[PDB]
Ligand binder design. Structure first.
Ligand SMILES: [Mg+2]
Length: 181
């Protein structure tokens, strides 16, 4: 599902990161406030999508790129997720981008089956505001609050030390256990 790990990612934990409401929040409603506007052609017609970036996402993503092998894994469709991530990931942090079709369908949910990834699950984390994405691996999860438009959010700032603590772990199940301890 994922390309072979690179030379530089060699010993790194693999962190799977969701897009909508975790890193960004999108809408069809025009706003003046928006960080990006992306044209998406819908059933062959063209819809402006207005995207707000979550506070600190740029610095959060940069640090993560220094510490982990970062993957984007979203249940949204590529035609949306690729341009939005292209503009969001202004430093090239994501090694891979997986979309709706790499998810499994579980009666109406799209689950991110971490075991299809080709990485040691003892060295994999998932960051996602929907517990339904991680039905099969809640023990690898680092939950995060949904975000929409709150400019005073500091959740990604709060989480940086957390991942800083985790980044050298040999088994995430032990580490998350001691973090929660
Ligand atoms: Mg989400």
């Amino acid at each position: 599902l994922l390309p072979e790990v690179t030379e530089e990612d060699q010993g790194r934990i693999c962190v799977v990161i969701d897009l909508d409401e975790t890193l960004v929040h999108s809408s069809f409603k025009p706003i003046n406030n928006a960080d990006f506007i992306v044209p998406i052609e819908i059933e062959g017609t063209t819809h402006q999508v207005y995207v707000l970036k979550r506070p600190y996402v740029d610095e959060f993503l940069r640090r993560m790129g220094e510490l982990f092998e970062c993957v984007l894994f979203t249940a949204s469709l590529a035609k949306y997720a690729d341009p939005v991530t292209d503009l969001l990931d202004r430093c090239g942090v994501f090694r891979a981008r997986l979309f709706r079709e790499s998810c499994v369908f579980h009666q109406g949910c799209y689950v991110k089956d971490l075991s299809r990834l080709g990485r040691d699950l003892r060295k994999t984390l998932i960051l996602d505001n929907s517990p339904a994405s991680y039905i099969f691996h809640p023990e690898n999860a680092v939950p995060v609050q949904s975000w929409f438009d709150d400019m005073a959010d500091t959740e990604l700032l709060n989480l940086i030390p957390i991942f800083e603590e985790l980044s050298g772990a040999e088994d995430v199940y032990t580490s998350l256990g001691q973090l929660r301890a």
